Design a protein around this ligand. Sequence first.
Ligand code: NAG
Length: 147
Amino acid sequence: FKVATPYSLYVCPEGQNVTLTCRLLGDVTFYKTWYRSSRGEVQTCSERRPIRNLTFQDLHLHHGGHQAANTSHDLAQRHGLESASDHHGNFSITMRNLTLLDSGLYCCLVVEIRHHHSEHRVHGAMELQVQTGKDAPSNCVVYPSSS
Ligand SMILES: *[C@@H]1O[C@H](CO)[C@@H](O)[C@H](O)[C@H]1NC(C)=O
């Protein structure tokens, strides 16, 4: 049971939209959320820092394997953040109108809860650099995670 991050680096200009993506390979509930963190030597995605004033708890989803889930219209409208899990193990966070305060190390956490004492936690890490200089790209440049 594991998480694939297609892309480890996203380099976007201010004012763009970006979707950060994690993909799930593998009844049971899932807890899935997003937070900014840091890339430690032995542990990455431990510390849970806010994304634009919201926390992993605000952005979290809780859904069954036959189920999709997304954050509310009022969250999207108010914070320009949409977190969404489709039926195909695609888990994403869509950020509207990037500012330089959006840069950071983003983590998707996915918890498989098979039972009260049976939780498996997996995370994916990806950097978002929001650029502001004359050389900033016209839209997101993205760097694959692998091969
Ligand atoms: C970002 O997304 C919204 C759709 O919610 C759209 O109105 C806007 O044109 C988009 N901005 C860019 C730069 O694509």
